[PDB]
């Protein structure tokens, strides 16, 4: 809201801070991806700070920041606050190795995919097999960033659950917990 | 809605064996049906049941429970389509006694695969997929047994809604005749 | 909705002079009032004579499951259960219920298994009360129903966990019924 | 719902000549001035022969409530309480108000406990008006159950301030059924 | 709702006993019946007493004292009993009772207040509507004052916010002449 | 709603055999339509004896209430008129049109008097054909109550220009009634 | 509403900020991003929170309580109006000694409020969850007001509202603000 | 809505230390105001501030953050009331400088005793009610200790709605003066 | 809408000491109006300020706020009906400065007495009804004093809605002159 | 909608593009464009552009009276429809400058509205529309010569003319053809 002529967030990203701190839908990805390559074709080397307060949103908006953040050259830090669940979780575990943080009283949840379908019995039978190839997507994805195996990833999503900061390090889904 | 000298006009027809299915089938209606059903055998284990079908269809499980009747009790159930049997009321003509499965000439039957729906975790989603697929494997084996048809054709012919006449469920083998005047 | 001559019944209450008891429908408290009515009402007509209950029914209220399990465990006649149809949830409870040896599936009827269902708002101390009282029904449910079945009390609850859907044949294997009625 | 042959009576009705009331609902003004009209009627057709309360009630209005429960106090047959299902709330109050002795609940039948429920908005003159009364509501219904418990107000009071889920043996103990019906 | 043995609802069944169930908010409907009940108990025996329970949250004013006024001029007693609560114009009617027959059960609960309305037009048409409430007031604490014993002024006072009375408060009060005992 | 013993009445069946009608409500098309039948059913029966027509009714439709009115006028037998609660509007016209001597209130009911509401939208044409109805409606209605009450139809339409609350004292003194009935 | 700059971002030049609704994500997410701004602007000025608010989301208010506690700036907090829930939670995190009430505002703390729906298991699940965050709550307050843990269950069982007197008694703020 | 750089008008007001209260008080328009307040006292702690004040009243802990910050800061500020100062609008009015508190001659100034809702538990109830009562305290010693009139006067002249003309508010120590044009 | 540095149409005319009075008045009409008679008369207390009145009427204290500030400010104000000027509209036309309240020749005046409602306890009914009935007084008083009819006569005509050409409002005072072309 | 925004460039050059219903936000509008503008320069005509299916009687009197009060005369363009007040305002523009382009079309009607209540309330209704309808009738019988009578028969239901047809009437001036 306040103007500093810059809005606080325009403001901030003059300094390469991107705030997510909202529910992931298209447009909101759409904002998040442009930023990232803004600031990349700014200066390609200097990192870049993304904060993350999030109950998630759409996977596949998710999967565009996510794969923007791969793609592009500077590094991306990742820095929890409040909570980052369900596809936050997932952006979060996604920062460059080494800088993804939470602070103490961070809260992080990961979870299996939700989602639905109704029609025909063929109809069906496509939106499970499409959601079940999704939640592989998103485990073997999780494994490779924090090191656990696939199979403890799918144990550990089958309901929701819930991790402090210091739990969320030593799961692999953080390198640090920020102090002050 | 009318009365006769008292019964309502269904009551009336009940008293001669007569069932008129005229709604779509939800457990109410299947509930009243597989009561009468029992009530006529009751009456007389041997006279033969009528079956009139005038329905779009509605719950598979209702479906089942006035098909699973059918084929429970000891008299024969005539199955006579009037207007439009789609869906699960295709399927309960298709049930009717062998020889005894019927439509009016310009009645009108529907095929079609089952439809439903699921919303929740992908574990969740899975679970009602398989339940769905698994419900219209059973379909497909009662209706190639009642028909002549083999699974493989009757999983083509109801992959989309396939609209039959009277003399085409004939050919089909869902009913037996086209009831002339 | 019929009416049938002898005076006057709907069918329903026909049936109930047979000693048949229908429930169709998901199970509230106005069901379960007229279920343990008519159950009450045949014990008093003959103590001796077996009642059959014909089950189609999406399950409901555990509440109003309970008074009906309850009622006919309490009775003297025998109760026979028939499933047609669908026993899911306190309907496949009340299934299982029936007397030992008199528990009947009709050969394409569906009998599915779950675990609770409910909802808590409020205060902290509210969801936790509200939590443990749904984990002590859920204890209380497979408790029972590994009496009636001969199951572990831990297989049910591994095979509650998720929505359980059985064959005919299926709940017989697993002691949810003695039979599957053949024509 | 079912009729019954004789004339022709609902299942409800054919209960009530057996001197048997159904509570199986809501309790609102409607339910209570039906069930002290039939306690009436009973204590009329015979002032000796008891008369068979079941509940299975989530609760309800606290003066629809308290019409039931000073007409049993009132009428000179003993009215035995049965609990199936569920007695919650007003509910719970009327179970315990049965003859004493003759107040039961079947095994798996629950029983709840708790404060009043209630709201006001307005001035806060009003509001206040407003919180008297449901203070002095709450008093008076926890003195009443500490007499048909034998519990001390103090007691009730600390167990009535949350939502208080009681099995059947649990309310036998609580003071307030006299005994666990088996079967 | 229940049906007795040719066949009468339970409601039927009591007014063959000269008992009537006020068991709801007053209405036009609901005043309609009690009034056509009590004249038809009256055309059977005019000698006989009534028996009016009454569990009722109060109504439309006007159709309360269509029964008010039915009760003073039909030649029986009517005895009200209170069960449950009888609040507004519920507490009218108990009140309104034959005197000395004027029961309340123990937990009853009895509500004395002041009318409630509404008006919205023009201020001349609110003046109206303001004008016809007053006198509604004064009518009904007038009567009140007349068969509980107690002057216009205390009426006045005691209703002017919603008050809750004890069964034995409202005998007390002069609403009731006793408290029924088991 | 309560049905009384004899075949079965209903309480309004049951009074109409003694030539009682009840009007309790609105007056719309379709409880004139019964009014009037009731009338002229009751004159079928005996044309000499009088008819008892109870009134408590906020009013309604002017063309329904004139069906009622003239039904009156038109009839043999005398019909008194006796309002209860409230008699307004419609209500109180047809108050005023029962048999001269026979009007009567008891002492606590209430009579207002107005002039007709109505509505109309459209094109000036068509504004201007609805308010000339309107008003030959309302001069319709103050001359035949100038007759029934005696008052000048000056003074009828100055006294319904608003709203005008009469008590039962007041409205005989008015001439729409002829007497107050005392207990 | 009104340019001076709008009168909000006029006081943020002053290292003022203004909480002065319900927590929310969108709230807490500009209230973060005016204090880092507030830091990298100066790291050793403090910093002036005023809170108005009836509480809101425990998660948003945490992201505020975390980076309050991990900037290096002195945040001051001042009660006005009134601050209930995680309102009264953000009170309490100010830089000890710099946490304020004007005299006629209130402060109000309860327990955490939720919801549940869904399978046994998963309300179990919820319900865990919220009566950790409780605990988590209770733990932070115990240590910025120097009450027990179990005081502090007892005193938010029900909601319990505070004068800023009784505030200050309590810990929750230093200071009553005279004029 | 119009522009005066560019101001829009309240904006030019602002700049001669005149703030507008001209709606209900909720927290958005008490954090504008408090904003405003701080705002000019940082410019100028010593030239004093003009509260105008047409305003239903809304939120009283929304109404006593303006209160107190007026309290709290160094320069007076005067209340001016136009149109209706009703229920918290009338307690900031009676809460101006002493001697610099105005209505216009037709305005209107109503005092009445709070209003809330509770719903819950008898305990929550209790709570509630607690609560809203001593709120009523809390307000009837301010506008004693502001208008001169004891608390048990304030309190039975706001049992109920009580409409004042500005002559009357004067008289009742809630103003000081009438504007005479 | 349109533009015109850059102005709105209205802002343009406010430059010019044309303040547009073209909706319902409520409190946020009135504090801006309120808000550009305070402007202009710190802008130039001498010269006079053209009102311009389009309004079916809207909030009573609204209206006084407006009426206050004109007759409080030191710049003659006068006021020109365009369309309609019915109820609190009619009421500030006739507030202009005498001598200076005009309508364009098709334009309506209507003057009516106050409109409201109450609901809740009898005491509370009673208290709006004399509020209301106070408003009407207080109205009544001023149109006398600023048209020259007695009191008697506006409560006469105002007891019903009653609309006026500009000429009529001419000949009963609300107005000084039919402007014409 | 495309960037001055376009209107603002047309009222430049003395346009006004009057293309909605007519209501009083739409009057007081118009009404300050055309005060505007005079006071720009009290000589040069302006040019009111109509496509309106008409609205509020008294917003239209309110530009009516408008226009006929300033010094410039006013020109009506109809394209696209004018219709109730908005023919009326076609035929108000400045003698000689009323026209309509070739496949416009213009209606005329009697006035609409809507009164509930009491009689006497109705009664008031009534005869205002009815003055209203008057009203409008005289000045068209003014504006466009025909007498009152013939008016008031041509309106007694909708009437849609075509720009040759209301040429002919007397409503507009000239059908404009092609440059
Ligand atoms: O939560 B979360 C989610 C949701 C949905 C989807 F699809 C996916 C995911 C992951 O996380
Ligand atoms: O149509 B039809 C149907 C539907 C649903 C299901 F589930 C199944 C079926 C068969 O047919
Ligand atoms: O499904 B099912 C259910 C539901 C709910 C509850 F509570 C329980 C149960 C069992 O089954
Ligand atoms: O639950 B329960 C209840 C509710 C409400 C009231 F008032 C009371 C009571 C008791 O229980
Ligand atoms: O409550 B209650 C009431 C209401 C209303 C009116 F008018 C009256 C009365 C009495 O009581
Ligand atoms: O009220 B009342 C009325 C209404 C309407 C019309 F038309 C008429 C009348 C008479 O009374
Ligand atoms: O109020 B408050 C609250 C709410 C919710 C949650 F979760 C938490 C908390 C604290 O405070
Ligand atoms: O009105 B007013 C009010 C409301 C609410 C509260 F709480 C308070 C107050 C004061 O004034
Ligand atoms: O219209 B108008 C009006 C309305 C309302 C009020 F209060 C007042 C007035 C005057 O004019
Ligand atoms: O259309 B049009 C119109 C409408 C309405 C009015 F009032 C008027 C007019 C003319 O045209």
Same mark, same amino acid.
Request: proline share 3%; aromatic share 6%.
């Given at each position: 809201?306040?103007?500093?002529?810059?809005?606080?967030?325009?403001?901030?990203?003059?300094?390469?801070?991107? =705030?997510?701190?909202?529910?992931?839908?298209?447009?909101? !990805?759409?904002?998040?991806?442009?930023?990232?390559?803004?600031?990349?074709?700014?200066?390609?080397?200097?990192?870049?700070?993304?904060?993350?307060?999030?109950?998630?949103?759409?996977?596949?908006?998710?999967?565009? @920041?996510?794969?923007?953040?791969?793609? @592009?050259?500077?590094?991306?830090?990742?820095?929890?606050?409040?909570?980052?669940?369900? =596809?936050?979780?997932?952006?979060?575990?996604?920062?460059?190795?080494?800088?993804?943080? !939470?602070?103490?009283? !961070?809260?992080?949840?990961?979870?299996?995919?939700?989602?639905?379908?109704?029609?025909?019995?063929?109809?069906?039978?496509? !939106?499970?097999?499409?959601?079940?190839?999704?939640?592989?997507?998103?485990?073997?994805?999780?494994?490779?960033?924090?090191?656990?195996?696939?199979?403890?990833?799918?144990?550990?999503?089958?309901?929701?659950?819930?991790?402090?900061?210091?739990?969320?390090?030593?799961?692999?889904? @953080?390198?640090?917990? =920020?102090?002050?």
């Amino acid at each position: 809201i306040p103007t500093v002529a810059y809005d606080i967030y325009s403001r901030l990203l003059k300094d390469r801070i991107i =705030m997510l701190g909202s529910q992931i839908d298209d447009n909101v !990805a759409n904002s998040i991806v442009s930023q990232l390559l803004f600031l990349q074709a700014q200066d390609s080397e200097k990192d870049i700070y993304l904060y993350i307060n999030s109950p998630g949103g759409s996977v596949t908006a998710g999967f565009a @920041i996510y794969d923007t953040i791969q793609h @592009i050259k500077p590094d991306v830090q990742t820095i929890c606050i409040g909570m980052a669940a369900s =596809m936050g979780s997932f952006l979060l575990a996604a920062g460059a190795k080494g800088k993804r943080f !939470a602070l103490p009283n !961070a809260e992080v949840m990961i979870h299996q995919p939700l989602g639905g379908a109704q029609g025909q019995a063929t109809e069906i039978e496509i !939106a499970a097999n499409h959601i079940l190839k999704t939640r592989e997507k998103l485990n073997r994805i999780l494994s490779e960033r924090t090191g656990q195996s696939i199979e403890k990833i799918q144990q550990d999503t089958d309901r929701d659950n819930f991790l402090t900061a210091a739990e969320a390090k030593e799961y692999g889904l @953080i390198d640090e917990v =920020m102090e002050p």
